[PDB]
């Protein structure tokens, strides 16, 4: 059993990427945000408060013949975003890219925060972190990936995110076609329930590589690259005019500036993020101030290799019984 689905950025900034997923019988197709930094499959639904849905596609569990209430069961989730969502829970048949999983927990939004309501292109999240992070009560549920694992040819998915362009998520196999050279695998710590790993250092542009251990999480569900304040200060030092803004809340740089690339280390290998990836465009419509893609982790508590770093690479999430993270160039 394998599965490939095309994943598509939601806007010209690549803020996020949506993937179509089939839920229910017959299928209702919703566009979900694949999130390797959470563990809940949650969807906008026929129970979602009507003043809280826009032009999202909703999941109607009463039109699925496979859909069943998980009685008493209940969820609540919160994001680094400050984003929130909650409700009750169904099991149903979920399909991604022709890979089918039956009796998947599909967590049906009753409530949803403003940030989600104003995002019309995202119909819900599909969490692909480790199941310990799942939020359903009183009985914790397993992720889609966990439910598929056993059925899979290999207990693996890959992420191949595009810069300004569609990409692919594969399940159960590695497209040797999709990257260049070698995959470099590196150890994953599961203890916090993240795809948590340890980078071996960094370079800015054509600069010397500094060997220093950077611990953080592979998170397809975060837009930006979040790195320690030291690292992030060295990057923007090389961009004339760049400054940390208290008003906008991060580093901004004049839009007419050239952005150096950013290299990070996985084992003895190196991934270069071209500087174009790091431009997130005018902080406001008309401004000549542009928002940077590398921002300080100091206020999160954790470093995040979000989409800015992952879309520079071909990324393997090896969900074996000792999990690993592979990076290749593409």
């Amino acid at each position: 059993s394998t599965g490939s689905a095309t994943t598509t950025p939601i806007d010209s900034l690549d803020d996020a990427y949506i993937t179509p997923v089939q839920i229910g019988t017959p299928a209702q197709t919703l566009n979900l945000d694949f999130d390797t930094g959470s563990s809940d499959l949650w969807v906008f639904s026929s129970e979602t408060t009507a003043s809280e849905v826009d032009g999202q596609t909703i999941y109607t569990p009463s039109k699925s013949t496979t859909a069943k209430l998980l009685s008493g069961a209940t969820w609540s989730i919160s994001y680094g975003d400050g984003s929130s969502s909650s409700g009750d829970v169904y099991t149903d048949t979920v399909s991604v890219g022709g890979l089918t999983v039956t009796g998947q927990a599909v967590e049906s939004a009753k409530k949803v925060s403003s940030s989600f309501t104003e995002d019309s292109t995202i119909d819900g999240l599909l969490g692909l972190a480790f199941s310990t992070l799942n939020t359903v009560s009183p009985t914790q549920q397993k992720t889609f990936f966990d439910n598929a694992k056993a059925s899979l040819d290999s207990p693996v998915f890959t992420a191949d995110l595009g810069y300004h362009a569609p990409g692919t998520y594969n399940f159960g196999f590695i497209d040797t076609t999709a990257y260049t050279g070698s995959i470099t695998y590196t150890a994953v710590s599961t203890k916090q329930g993240f795809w948590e790993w340890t980078s071996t250092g960094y370079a800015v542009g054509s600069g010397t590589f500094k060997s220093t251990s950077i611990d953080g999480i592979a998170d397809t569900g975060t837009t930006l690259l979040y790195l320690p304040a030291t690292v992030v200060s060295a990057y923007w030092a090389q961009v004339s005019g760049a400054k940390s803004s208290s008003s906008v809340g991060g580093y901004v740089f004049p839009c007419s500036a050239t952005l150096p690339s950013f290299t990070f280390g996985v084992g003895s290998a190196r991934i270069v993020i071209p500087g174009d990836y790091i431009d997130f465009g005018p902080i406001s419509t008309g401004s000549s101030s542009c928002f940077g893609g590398i921002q300080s982790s100091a206020g999160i508590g954790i470093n995040i290799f979000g989409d800015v770093a992952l879309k520079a690479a071909f990324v393997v999430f090896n969900g074996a019984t000792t999990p690993t993270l592979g990076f290749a160039s593409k």
């Binding site: 803020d15 996020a16 945000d33 694949f34 999130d35 390797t36 930094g37 959470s38 563990s39 809940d40 989730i77 919160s78 994001y79 680094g80 975003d81 984003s83 999240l125 969490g127 972190a129 992070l133 939020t135 998170d219 397809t220 569900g221 975060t222 837009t223 930006l224 997130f280 999160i300 508590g301 954790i302 995040i304 979000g306």
Partner: peptide
């Protein structure tokens, strides 16, 4: 931007 369970 978005930042998915931190």
């Amino acid at each position: 931007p978005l930042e998915f369970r931190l």
